[PDB]
Structure formats: structure tokens, C-alpha cells
Amino acid sequence: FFFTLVPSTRMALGTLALVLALPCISPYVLQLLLATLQAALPLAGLAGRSYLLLASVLESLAGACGLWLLVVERSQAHSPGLLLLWTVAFAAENLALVSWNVQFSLWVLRYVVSGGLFVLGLWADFGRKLRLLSGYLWPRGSPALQLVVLICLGLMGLERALNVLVPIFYRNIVNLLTEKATVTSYVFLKFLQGGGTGSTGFVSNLRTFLWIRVQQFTSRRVELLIFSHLHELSLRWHLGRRTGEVLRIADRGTSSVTGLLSYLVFNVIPTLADIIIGIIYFSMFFNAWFGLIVFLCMSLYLTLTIVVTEWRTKFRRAMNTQENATRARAVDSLLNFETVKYYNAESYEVERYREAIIKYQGLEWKSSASLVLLNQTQNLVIGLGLLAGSLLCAYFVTEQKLQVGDYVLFGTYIIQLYMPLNWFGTYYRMIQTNFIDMENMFDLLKEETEVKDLPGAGPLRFQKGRIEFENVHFSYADGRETLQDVSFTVMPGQTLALVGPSGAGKSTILRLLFRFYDISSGCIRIDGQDISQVTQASLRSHIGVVPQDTVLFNDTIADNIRYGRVTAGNDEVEAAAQAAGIHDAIMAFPEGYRTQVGERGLKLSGGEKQRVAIARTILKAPGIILLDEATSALDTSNERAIQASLAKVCANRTTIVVAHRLSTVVNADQILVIKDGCIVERGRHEALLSRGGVYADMWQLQQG
Amino acid sequence: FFFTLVPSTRMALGTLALVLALPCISPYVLQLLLATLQAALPLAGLAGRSYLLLASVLESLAGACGLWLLVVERSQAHSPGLLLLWTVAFAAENLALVSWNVQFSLWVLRYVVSGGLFVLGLWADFGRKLRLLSGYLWPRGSPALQLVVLICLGLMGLERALNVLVPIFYRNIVNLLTEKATVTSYVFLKFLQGGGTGSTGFVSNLRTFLWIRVQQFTSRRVELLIFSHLHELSLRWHLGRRTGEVLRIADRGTSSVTGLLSYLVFNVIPTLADIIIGIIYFSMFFNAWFGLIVFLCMSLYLTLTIVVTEWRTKFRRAMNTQENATRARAVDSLLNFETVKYYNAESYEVERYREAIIKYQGLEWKSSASLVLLNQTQNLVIGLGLLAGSLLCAYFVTEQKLQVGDYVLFGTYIIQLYMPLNWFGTYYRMIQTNFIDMENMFDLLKEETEVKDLPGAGPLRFQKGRIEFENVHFSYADGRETLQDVSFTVMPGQTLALVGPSGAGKSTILRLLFRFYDISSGCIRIDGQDISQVTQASLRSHIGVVPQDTVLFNDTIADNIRYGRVTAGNDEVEAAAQAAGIHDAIMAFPEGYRTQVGERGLKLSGGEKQRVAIARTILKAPGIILLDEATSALDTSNERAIQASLAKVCANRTTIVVAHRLSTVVNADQILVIKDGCIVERGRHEALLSRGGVYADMWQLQQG
């Protein structure tokens, strides 16, 4: 009787008013008809009208009006289907009326049940490893995710507890079936069966659902750590490595961390804890040889799965090598179609390719048959363990020395213990692959620098822009002298122009002004102070180097300009684009001031790429200028335009230029050619032409 | 009593004499000690010595001597460990002696058991689809594999029979547990439990083991069929396609056929047959609403798994697109390390890359949470179906209107029915991928030719080698005239040399002598008969064309020479190598006469590659010669050597040469230049020099 009112209260409590707050013609009239029928049913209940009747009428009145509001709010433009389904599910009390075979309530219930049906129808060392990983499970200094880690370990402790405790309740169910040979207490056991067996995979899903956010934070932390640490400078270590393997080992390391911690806390610790707690549960059930023979079963299954996966891996390697060989022979016979047609190997090459197919497919049969013998001897000893355990329990129940009828517990319990063991055994090759993915990343975490930030690293006192060199040296190898004993002092507002030999000594000198490399001896100073005692970022924040190339990331053009200095608004972007003059290219381009460029976006011409580069350096606004002028010259409008923009960025600036062109070198303050690790001549253009040094030879080279 | 003798007979029958035939110091002395102890045990049994005693002594004598033979045969240089293990396993009868707590037998058994323990220790439209696939399950005309297909369908019918029938025997086991509340008949049920539950995965492994050889024959048949059919000639269809996609669609089609027939006969037909036979088993058990609610369970699980895999696939596509975008931005920020260091984006690019990582990882959380909601609502309605079914069976057993105690059958049977349903539901995307892999292959099976073998295709009456052209035309497109109205008759033992324009008209003319292409009109005949009425292979078996390039397959050099004609022995290979003169290169190469060459083997120089090509054509031995002389000339020793080998293969032969060199054209019978689809001049070298045609212009071009 009260169960119907409780079910009505539970149905009426489907967050009707609560959700209605939270979520904020013929079909609308059909809903208004249901709301009219619900108002009529509630007015019929009020007309029929004790506290249950008044509470029913109150629930009916609120639910009915909520239907009108829900329908009207959809007109002002899922959950109603859930409400109607939950209500129609609660209407299964009807059978309790039929069980009788007062009246006004039956008519009201019959009218309600029809009105709901209408609503639903209308709605339609390993110590170092463990210490480092226990540190790797610690996010940060914030109290909102350590609590979630506590939830994860709490459900992890709950899962094996329920996983061992609910087959005992199944045993209680069948035992009480024998002892009643009661329905109410049997239903109070069956509810534990329902909410227990509908909870194993459910609690595994909740575990993995919070494990997702655990992996989110850990992957963020390790990926940003290694991405910061691969942005240190060791260029000889850099350039021999391609970018693809360098970031592939990083992705393998973060998925190594993910798979490693998730599997070692999800399928290694819990299955060993499950086996241990099963044997100890038997040790509090009955201390006998049963735990020993079941322990023999699980250990034997583990050992055979490991050793036949070790049998599997060599067959997989041989099968991979044979399929690579046959597909290579196939495509390389297909490559020269014309000589395959020139000879009458039309019926021969199919025979030799079929021979290679047979030679691969035999090893394919061997590998798949090894899988067959794995699963075969596996299920054979599983059947033998079930047979031995089931016979010893059968002997026990027919001898009645323990509690009887419990054979279903020991029957399903071996299968339930075994079900994670192959789930482990398929990942023995995987955990060692995770180890070799994480160990190289651990080596990569903490390696080295090439330029070393000495203590006392301070700011760069940008007084005037006066750069002096004093008997300096350099090596990128042993005895490697691309630069040897040069010395100068370049002044503010003046310009050095540099030609070198056919070699990267010019760019190397440009990089050691930048301190992109190191010096073995000598003295390089900027504005009085040595370049090596200071912070690198405060050194290179006052430096603008024009590169000969120009990268274009897959992004838009205002972000590409703000790549010069990211603290800009769009006003300085447009002002720098009008300073360079490349804003008219943005007029010629579609997207306003956000033209998507790069590798897949909108491409560019080479002088315009250098115009985007010089616009980036214009936005960056240093005082120290270092141009890398291309040997690839352009049209004289493009040539004098890039020289005029170089003038507009270089006027009254401390400017240092490497170049091989004419207009740059016919006007500068001093022209230097630096070949074989030394300055080979010094002087202006008129000085080199009046002394006739190697500038005469390179004058013949620029002539032709 | 007799069980011990039967076990002794079964142990003695471990194929001791049978295998010993089939398979054909301190450890040897240890085995001789065991054989001496076994001779002593058998002599003790003969000394103790009725028919069982004489049969035991006979088994002991044969087994003992087999141990001496097995040990000695290993000295004359696994199974002995199996024999000793099977024997020591049979020695578990010992407990039957202990059960007593005659004598000579006990001492003999005690001495035997010790002797075995020593041996073991010492040893250590879909209608068209179904019709075509039912044809695709038919191998050939041989009676040894259709029988295996009958075995496959027999075990397939056996598997569902046992899979439904053995939980009824589990129900019999627990029912007889209740009705004995007998041990011998209960063991005669428990043996069915053992040999039945140790047979489900076992018969699945035997099925898949013979399915392996089924896949072997079907993959051989379909791969060789499509490999023959991709070796037809449609060159405009050929050249636009790369080899990799052409063979990748073939590998996808054969694995499509494999996965398609194996899954549609293994996880679609049997699981539907299992559901149907479960409901019909209930229909012969009790015809009620139980079959309807279980049918509701299985259908609801199927529908939700399908629709949330359809929910899954768009999340997988979006997650793939986002991970491609983030990894592309990451590697393209890493590409220009020097500008990343030139600007102070060292702390900015890590922030923008972390922003992209967050933007991808949110969709990663959404996809993995979609997997969570899949498994969650899955296990939720599985628990609801278990709850409804288990409660209705609980109501039935507490009301006793059926056979009681059967609740374990309906308990495990829903799980056992369900266990293949997700095994199907994970392959809904896979079967449609198999369909799109097989349909294009079906289109590729039967397409077309470009040169059509007309009926009346006969041999090539190789009388003299006289080739005539009569107002001929050609097109590889619409209105495409690289050749238009040329006509000649080249004689036996004489030589035409051909120069063309900067275009492939020369090679195209060379290919239409070969009938590599088709003609729109005209008349091309060889030795009186038209080239188009005949078989292609009998046309191109009397033709040797020197190609400008030379393919080298990943194989050895005698097979590379026998690529000219595969019917050769090694005598003609060596004779042709001495005819060309490239056998001294085989002397310079390591492997005798089998030097492994190709892409991974031993490489070559270009003139020597052409020497291997001309050795192939020398071995092929035609009369019709067609040289494709390279424009890339070599050293004058190499040049006059390849011209001298061309002379040695071309002397008194019907020879046609395309060339651009000098020594070929200063001696030939007639020199033709064919530009813009016409012969532009005719005559010998002295004729072109005495009339001064375009040979004057190309004389200036060869001069410089």
C-alpha cells in the first residue's frame, strides 16, 4: 500500500522542479492536452478528496504544471522523455490493482496511466622506478585532484572487495534456496545480487573515468616538461637528429607513462591482490589443500602464458620479415611493367610470386598454429584445474564435511579469478616496450646545455650598442677553427658589412654574436660587459637578426607578425605592417587581417616571405640589428625595396650585416671579408678598390 | 582393482614401441641405472610370478627395454619426459595401497614409483555477395580439402550444440546434489562436466586451426587471380596509378575476403544460431514470457552497441583530426629552432602548444567518456536483464511451478549468451570496411584490355624478319597524333636508325612495333601477316628490345640473367655471359655465379646495367632486334664496347634501332628522323649530309 505512494513520491521526485530551473502547434496542443488531462486528474483527486491523498494531489499539481512549463519552454525555443519513461516505469504498480480482482483512485490511476502513455508516445633499478612513479602520481599544489586520486584508490579497494564478496552472496542465494526447501529475505538477498553484479563493470568504468583525468594531468605535466627540456641548446646534438624521431620518442614516452602507470596500478596490483585475497578468503573459509591446488592452477596458467608469448614473438618477427620480403618482391616486380611485358615472364613471375607467397604463408600457419597451441594448452589446463577443484568440492559435498550446495561458488569463482590473467598476459611485451620508451626519455630529461648560463646572470645594460671582439676563438669539434683571432669594436649608428668564403663561417660568426655557440678563449663584449656572464634571454631580447629563410607556421598572419613579440595588440601589428609596407599584401589576401598561412594555408613569394620576416623584426624593435642578406637577389624594385626597408629599420641603429650584394657594401662604414678563420682584408669599398685585394677577385665573380 | 591394471595398460600404452619407430656418460649411466632398475623390477615381477601379472611383466619388459633404447638412441645423437610424466601421472594409484592401511606387488610398486621419479628427475546486392562467397568457399577439383570444409561445418554445428547442452548438465549436477540430499553417477555427470567445459574453447581452437588452411587456399586463389588480372595491359590506366596503392588495395581485398568470410561464418551465423537455439530450447523447456524478456535483453544490447559505436566513430575521427593538427603544429614549431631561439617565444610557444594540447585532450576526454557511457549503459541493462530474469526464476522456484534449483542455469546462461555479442558489436565498422575493400577489387577483377586478342590468334610465322608499315595511325587520347601516315618495309639483315624530336614519339613508335599500344587505322604487318590478328605472347616471343634503363630485382645474378628466358640451364647462362663479356664482372663479384643484386644487394654501374640487359636479350635469342640506345653516352671504351656487343648480337639480324649517337648512324642501312608525327627526312648519313636537311641542325646540336 505505502510502496505505491513511495513509488509515486519517487516518480514525482524525478528532479521536475529542480531540472526545470537547471536547464533554463499540434504537438504543443497535444502537450497542452496532456497538461489539461493532468490538471483534470489532479482536480479529480482534489474533488475525490488523506495526507497521502493531499501529498499525491500536491505532487500531481506540481508535475502537471511542470509538463505545461516544459512544453511551453520548448515552444519558446529529451528530458521530458526520461521523465515520462521514469513515470511510465513507476506506473507498473497497476498490477497491484489487478491483484485485487478506492474506486475514484482506480479511475484516477487508470486515467493517469493513459495520460502518461500519451506523454511518452508524444515525446517520441625498479626501486627508482617505483619511487619516481609514486612521485609521478602527484599532480600539483591544489586540493581538488588529490581528492580524486583518493577516490580512485578507494574504488580500487572497493572493487576487489565486492569481486570476492558477491559470489559468497550467490552462494547464500542458492543455500537459502535449499534451506527454504523466505521469499522476502530471499528478495533482500536478490537485491544484493542485482546491485552487486550490476556494479563490477560499473565500478570499473567509474575508475577508468576518473583515471582519464589522472592521465590528462600527468600527460600535460610530462609533455610540457619534456617540451621545455628539448628546447635547450645543443645544436650538434640537434642537427643530426630529425624532428620526427625526436618528437616520436616524446609521444612514445608520454604514452609509455600513461600505459605504464595505468596498467601497473590497474592490472598488476589488483589481480595479484585478487589472487592473494582469494587464497586468504579460503584460509578464513577452510584451511586445506584447496588453496594449494588453486594456487597451482593460477601460477601454472601465468607461467605458460608468459613462455608461449615468448614463443609467439619470434614467430611474429619472422612473419613480419617474410611479409616485408614478399611485398617488396611483388612491388619491385610490378615497377618495371614494360620489361615484364617485354619478356614472357607473364606466367613465370606469377609462379615465383606464388612461391614467395607459399614461403611466407607456411610461417603464417606456424605463427597462427602457435596461437592455437597457446589457447589450447591454456584451456586444457583450465579444464584440468576446474576438473580437479570441482571433483574435490564434489567429494566434499557428497561427504558433507563442510557447508553443502556451495559448488556454484567454486565453479564460477575460478573463471572469475582467471578472467584478468590473460588480460595481464597479453601485455608482457607491452610493459617492456613501455620501459624502453620511458628510459630514453628519462635520459633526455636532464642532459646538458652548450651555452652555459653562469651565475651572476644579469640584465643587458643597453647603453649604446658597441660590440668589441678581442683575440677570440671558437670550436664546434676538436681543433675546429672556422674562426681564429679576430678583433674589432663596432660603434653605434654605424655599419659593418661582411663577405666570407663559400662556407658557413659567416653564419657561424653571426651565431656567436648571438652566443648561439660557445667560445674556447678570447673576449667578446657588448657595451663594455662580456657576453658570457649574463642571462641568454636578456641578451637576445635586444637583438634582431634577419634570417635568409622564413618559416610560416600553419596559422594566421597577425599571429605570424606577433611572433616577433607576443605582447603586442593589433594596433602595433598594423603599424608595423604599414611601416614595412606588407599590409597591402594583407589587402590582396582574403581574411582581413587574419590570413591563414603556412603549409596548408595561403602561400607566398620569397621576397614577401622576407618582408614578413622583416615585419616581425620591426615589431620586435631591438637596437642591435644583424641582417642575413640572401645571396639570391631579386628584381631591382624588390631589391631596392628590401634595401629601403632595411634602411627604414636600420637608420640611426647599431647595424651589422652579412651580405654578398652591391648596394649594401657600397655605402657601409666598413667592409670585411673573413676567410679561412681570419680577416683577409679590411677597409671600405673605395679602400678595397684602391688596394685591390680579394675584392678584385670577387668583383670578377659578381660580374660573372 | 582392475582400474590399476587398466591404468598400467594405459600408461604402458604411451606409444612406447610406436613412437620409438616413428621418431627414428653420467646421464647415460643414470638412464642405464633406471633401465637396470626396470629390468630388476620386471625380473622381480617374473620371480614373484596371473594373466594380469603376465601382462604387467610383459608391459614392464617392453617399457624397460624401450627406456634403454631411448637412452641409447640419444647417445647415438623431450618425448621421454612426456613418457615419464605420463607414467608418473599414472602412478597416482599408490593412494589405493595407502587406502588398505600382494606384498611383492606393493614392494614392486614402491620400487617402480621410485624408479619413475628417478626417470622424470633425470629427464629434467547481398544475394550476389552470398552467391559469390559460397562459390569462394569452394577450393578446387581435389577431394582432400572439401572434406576439411565438411569437418569445419561439422565442428561448427557441434559447438553450439555443446554450448547450449552442457549448462543443462551443470543443472543436472546441482539438481542431483539436491536429490542425493549417488557419488558414482555423480562422477559420471562430473566427467561430462570436465570433458564438456574443457571442450568449448578447445573446439573453437580446432575450428580456427582448420580455418587457417581454408584461409591459405582462399588467399592463394584470390591473390593469384588478381595478380594475373593486374598484369593485363591498359597503360594509361597503369601509369597514373602508383604501384603502392595498386597493391595496397589488393592486400586490403584479400584480407577483406579473409576477415569477411571468417567473421560472417564464425561470429554472425553462429551467434544468431545460438540466440535462436536458446529461445527454442526454452520453447521445448517451458513456453512462457521468459523467452520474450531474454529476447528483449539480447536485442536491446545489440541495438545499443550498434548505435553507440555509431556515436564512437565521429569522436574517433575528430580526435584523429585534432591529434594530427597538434602534432603538425608541434613539429612545425620545432622545424625552425633558430627563429624560435631568435625570438623570445621560448615561454610563449610552450603556452600555445599547451593550448593546442588542451584543445585536443578535451575531445580525447569526450571520446573516452563516450566509451565509458557505452560500457556503462551496456552493463546497466545487462544487470537489469539479469535482475528481471533472475527475479522471475526466483519467483518460479519459490512458487515451485517448474523444476527447482535450476537458478544457476539461467544465471550463467545469460552471460554465456552475451559473451559473443560484444565480440560481434566491435566489428560493425569492420565489415563495412571489408565491403569497400572487396567491391573495388571486384571491379578490378574483370575490367579491360588495351590491345585486344582477336579470335584467330595464331603463331608468328618467323620466315625472314620483314616489317612493313602502310599509312598507319595511332592515338592514346582524343585526336592525339604523335604518329600519322608513315609507311616502309624494312628488310632482313638490314638496319634502320631513328632520331626524333624532344619527345616520346620514338619510344611510342617502338612500342607500337611491339603492339604495346593500339592503332586507329592503317596496316602494320610483320613478314606478310598483320600484327593485330595474332596472339600477343607468340608475337613478343620473337622480339628483343634493349631498354634504356635496367631493373635489378632483389635476387641473384643467374636468376637475373635467366629473366631473359626462364627455360635455361646455367650452361646457357654462362655461355651468354661469355658472349657479352660480363662474366668477368661476376668474377669481380663475390658469390660465384649467384651474386645477390638489386635494391638491397650488390649494386652496379650504368653501362654494366645495360650489359646485364643485353645479356638477358642475348639469352632470350630472338631474331627481331629493337635497340633503345641511351642518349647518355659513356666512355669511348664503354661506348665502342656496347656498340661491339650490339654488333655481336646484331650481325646478320633483322635490326631496328632508336638512337641519338654517332657510330650507330654512320653505318646503318637507312636513317630516319620522325618529328611532329611524320618522317621529316629520309636517307643514309651521306644522303642527309648531301641534301642538308634537319641533320645539319642536329649536327650542330651534337657538336654543341
DSSP B286-331: --SSHHHHHHHHHHHHHHHHHHHHHHHHHHHHHHHHHHHHHHHHHH
Looking at the DSSP bridge assignments, the partners of residue B624 are: B543, B654
Give kind and range of the element (H or E) at residue B57.
helix B51-76
Q: Which parts of A are annotated binding residues?
A: 476, 500-511
Nearest Cα residue in chain A from B361: A216
CA B47 from chain centre, in angstroms, equals: 64
In a domain, B91, yes or no: yes
- Cell readout for A335 is 615497377
- Cell readout for A399 is 561427504
Under 8 Å between Cβ of A162 and A221: no
Who's near A523: CB < 8 A, 6+ residues apart?
A: A468, A469, A470, A471, A472, A530
Spatial separation of the C-alpha atoms in residues B669 and B102, rounded to whole Å: 111
Interstrand relation of B467-470 and B523-526 (parallel, antiparallel or unpaired): antiparallel
Q: Which parts of A are annotated binding residues for ATP?
A: 476, 500-511
Q: What does DSSP assign to residue B473?
A: B
Phi-psi bin for A677: left (phi > 0), alpha (psi -120 to 50), beta? left
Under 8 Å between Cβ of B506 and B677: no
- Cell readout for B256 is 577483406
Alpha carbons within 13 A on the beta-carbon side of A32? 9
What's the structural domain count of chain A? 5
Name the nearest CA neighbour of A327 among A339, A315, A316, A319: A319
Who's near B423: CB < 8 A, 6+ residues apart?
A: B267, B271
For this entry, resolution in Å reads 5.2
Q: What does DSSP assign to residue B501?
A: -
Residues B109 and B237 reside in one and the same domain? no
Residues A197 and A235 reside in one and the same domain? yes
Q: How close A621 gets to chain B, by Cα (Å)?
A: 11
Residues A261 and A308 reside in one and the same domain? no
In a domain, A353, yes or no: yes
Q: How close B349 gets to chain A, by Cα (Å)?
A: 9
CATH code of the domain covering residue A561: 3.40.50.300
Q: Does A345 touch chain B (CB under 8 A)?
A: yes
Spatial separation of the C-alpha atoms in residues A500 and A505, rounded to whole Å: 7
B505 a known binding residue? yes
In the 3-class helix/strand/coil scheme, how is B208-248 assigned residue by residue? HHHHHHHHHHHHHHHHHHHHHHCCCCCHHHHHCCCHHHHHH
Residues A234 and A300 reside in one and the same domain? no
Task: Write the residue in A174, A205, A540 that is nearest to B376 by C-beta.
Answer: A205
Spatial separation of the C-alpha atoms in residues A360 and A355, rounded to whole Å: 9
In a domain, A439, yes or no: no
From chain A, the residues in CB contact with B376 under 8 A are 202, 205
Go through chain B and tell me how many residues it has. Answer: 704
Residue span of the structural domain in which A25 resides: 2-123
In a domain, B307, yes or no: no
Q: Which residue has the cell 647415460?
A: B28
Under 8 Å between Cβ of B359 and B322: yes
Residues A345 and A356 reside in one and the same domain? yes
From chain B, the residues in CB contact with A170 under 8 A are 411
Interface test with A, best of B342, B352, B382 (most A CBs within 10 A): B342
Residue type, B35: A
Largest CA distance in chain A: 127
Q: Listing from the earlier edge strand, what are the strands of the sheet with B523-526?
A: B488-490, B467-470, B523-526, B529-530
Nearest Cα residue in chain A from B179: A178
Under 8 Å between Cβ of B550 and B610: yes
Spatial separation of the C-alpha atoms in residues B527 and B522, rounded to whole Å: 16
Residues B504 and B640 reside in one and the same domain? yes
Give kind and range of the element (H or E) at residue B423.
helix B421-425
Backbone angles phi, psi at B589, to 5 degrees: -95, 155
Q: Does A353 touch chain B (CB under 8 A)?
A: yes
Who's near B320: CB < 8 A, 6+ residues apart?
A: none
Under 8 Å between Cβ of A595 and A559: no
Nearest Cα residue in chain A from B353: A224
Under 8 Å between Cβ of B356 and B333: no
Please calculate the CA angle B217-B223-B229 and round it to the nearest 5 degrees. 135
Helix (H, G, I), strand (E, B) or coil at A603: coil
What burial class does residue A329 get, using C-beta atoms within 10 Å of its C-beta: 0-12 exposed, 13-18 middle, 19+ buried? buried
Alpha carbons within 13 A on the beta-carbon side of B604? 26
Give kind and range of the element (H or E) at residue B540.
helix B537-540
Task: Report CA torsion sign: A284, A285, A286, A292.
Answer: negative
Name the nearest CA neighbour of A544 among A623, A475, A445: A623
Domain end call among A253, A286, A319:
A286
What burial class does residue B331 get, using C-beta atoms within 10 Å of its C-beta: 0-12 exposed, 13-18 middle, 19+ buried? middle
Q: What does DSSP assign to residue B456?
A: S
Helix (H, G, I), strand (E, B) or coil at A624: strand
Residues B606 and B641 reside in one and the same domain? no
Residues B538 and B683 reside in one and the same domain? yes
**DSSP output for A74-141:** HHH--HHHHHHHHHHHHGGGHHHHHTT--HHHHHHHHHHHHHHHHHHHHH--HHHHHHHHHHHT---S
Task: Report CA torsion sign: A59, A60, A61, A67.
Answer: positive
Looking at the DSSP bridge assignments, the partners of residue A679 are: A674
B122-142 burial, b at 16+ Cβ within 10 Å, e below that, comes to bbeeeeeeeeebeeeeebeee
Q: How close A47 gets to chain B, by Cα (Å)?
A: 38
Contact A350 B228 (CB under 8 A): yes
- Cell readout for B217 is 587456399
Q: What does DSSP assign to residue A22?
A: S
Task: Report CA torsion sign: B334, B340, B346, B348.
Answer: negative
C-alpha pair distances (Å), A304 with each of A291, A298, A365, A387, B496: 20, 10, 21, 19, 75
From chain A, the residues in CB contact with B251 under 8 A are 327
Interface test with A, best of B341, B351, B535 (most A CBs within 10 A): B341
Contact B177 A407 (CB under 8 A): yes
Q: Does A289 touch chain B (CB under 8 A)?
A: no
In a domain, B424, yes or no: no
Q: Contacts from B137-141 at CB under 8 Å and sequence distance 24+?
A: B137/B214, B137/B218, B137/B261, B139/B217, B139/B218, B139/B221, B140/B217
Q: Does A225 touch chain B (CB under 8 A)?
A: no
Interface test with A, best of B173, B200, B205 (most A CBs within 10 A): B205
**How many Cβ pairs within 8 Å bridge chains A and B?**
275
Helix (H, G, I), strand (E, B) or coil at A336: coil
Spatial separation of the C-alpha atoms in residues B506 and B512, rounded to whole Å: 10
Q: Which residue has the cell 616577433?
A: A564
Residues B491 and B627 reside in one and the same domain? yes
Residues B132 and B7 reside in one and the same domain? no
Go through chain A and tell me how many residues it has. Answer: 704
A420-443 burial, b at 16+ Cβ within 10 Å, e below that, comes to bbeebbebeeebeebeebbeebee
Under 8 Å between Cβ of B66 and B42: no
Backbone angles phi, psi at A602, to 5 degrees: -105, 120
**How many other C-beta atoms are found inside a 10 Å radius of the C-beta of residue B203?**
16
- Cell readout for A18 is 529542480
Under 8 Å between Cβ of A472 and A486: yes
Helix (H, G, I), strand (E, B) or coil at B169: helix
Domain end call among B220, B251, B267:
B267
Interstrand relation of A543-546 and A670-675 (parallel, antiparallel or unpaired): unpaired
Interface test with A, best of B170, B217, B347, B379 (most A CBs within 10 A): B379
Looking at the DSSP bridge assignments, the partners of residue B681 are: B673
Interstrand relation of B523-526 and B529-530 (parallel, antiparallel or unpaired): antiparallel
Contact A338 B516 (CB under 8 A): yes
Q: Does B92 touch chain A (CB under 8 A)?
A: no
Contact A341 B516 (CB under 8 A): yes
Domain end call among B74, B105, B123:
B123
Helix (H, G, I), strand (E, B) or coil at B525: strand
**How many other C-beta atoms are found inside a 10 Å radius of the C-beta of residue B671?**
25
Give kind and range of the element (H or E) at residue B497.
strand B495-499
Q: Does A136 touch chain B (CB under 8 A)?
A: no
Name the nearest CA neighbour of B589 among B612, B566, B567, B569: B612
Spatial separation of the C-alpha atoms in residues B474 and A145, rounded to whole Å: 77
C-alpha pair distances (Å), B431 with each of B217, B254, B306: 21, 14, 13
Spatial separation of the C-alpha atoms in residues B616 and B544, rounded to whole Å: 9
**DSSP output for A279-319:** HHHHHHH--SSHHHHHHHHHHHHHHHHHHHHHHHHHHHHHH
Under 8 Å between Cβ of B69 and B61: no
Under 8 Å between Cβ of B235 and B517: yes
Q: Which residue has the cell 571491379?
A: B443
Contact A332 B554 (CB under 8 A): yes
Task: Write the residue in A243, A348, A383 that is nearest to B331 by C-beta.
Answer: A243
Task: Write the residue in A247, A341, A386 that is nearest to B330 by C-beta.
Answer: A247
Residues B88 and B204 reside in one and the same domain? no
Q: Which residue has the cell 654574436?
A: A513
Interstrand relation of A624-628 and A654-658 (parallel, antiparallel or unpaired): parallel
Under 8 Å between Cβ of B210 and B151: yes
Spatial separation of the C-alpha atoms in residues A304 and A292, rounded to whole Å: 18
Q: Does B394 touch chain A (CB under 8 A)?
A: yes
B501 a known binding residue? yes
In a domain, A420, yes or no: no
Name the nearest CA neighbour of B221 among B103, B128, B133, B136: B136
**DSSP output for A489-557:** EEPTT-EEEEE--SSTHHHHHHHHHTTSS--SSSEEEETTEETTSS-SHHHHTTEEEE-SS----SB-H
Spatial separation of the C-alpha atoms in residues A174 and A409, rounded to whole Å: 10
In a domain, A507, yes or no: yes
Under 8 Å between Cβ of B199 and B162: yes
Residues A201 and A262 reside in one and the same domain? yes
Residue type, A76: Q
Q: How close B500 gets to chain A, by Cα (Å)?
A: 21
B507 a known binding residue? yes
Helix (H, G, I), strand (E, B) or coil at A234: coil
Contact A341 B212 (CB under 8 A): no
Largest CA distance in chain B: 127
Spatial separation of the C-alpha atoms in residues A109 and B377, rounded to whole Å: 31
Give the CA dihedral A197, A203, A208, A212, nearest 10 degrees.
140
Nearest Cα residue in chain B from A207: B372
Give kind and range of the element (H or E) at residue B530.
strand B529-530
Q: Does A401 touch chain B (CB under 8 A)?
A: no
Task: Write the residue in B190, B361, B565 that is nearest to A394 by C-beta.
Answer: B190
Interstrand relation of B678-683 and B670-675 (parallel, antiparallel or unpaired): antiparallel
> What's the start-to-end Cα distance of chain B, in Å?
109
Who's near B17: CB < 8 A, 6+ residues apart?
A: B62, B66
Angle, helix B51-76 to helix B79-90, in steps of 10 degrees: 160
In a domain, B347, yes or no: no
Contact A390 B193 (CB under 8 A): yes
Looking at the DSSP bridge assignments, the partners of residue B524 are: B469
C-alpha pair distances (Å), B436 with each of A321, A538, B238, B253, B459: 28, 59, 21, 9, 42
Angle, helix A570-580 to helix A606-620, in steps of 10 degrees: 130
C-alpha pair distances (Å), B470 with each of A562, A640, B41: 72, 64, 101
What burial class does residue B538 get, using C-beta atoms within 10 Å of its C-beta: 0-12 exposed, 13-18 middle, 19+ buried? middle
Give the CA dihedral A6, A9, A14, A15, nearest 10 degrees.
-130
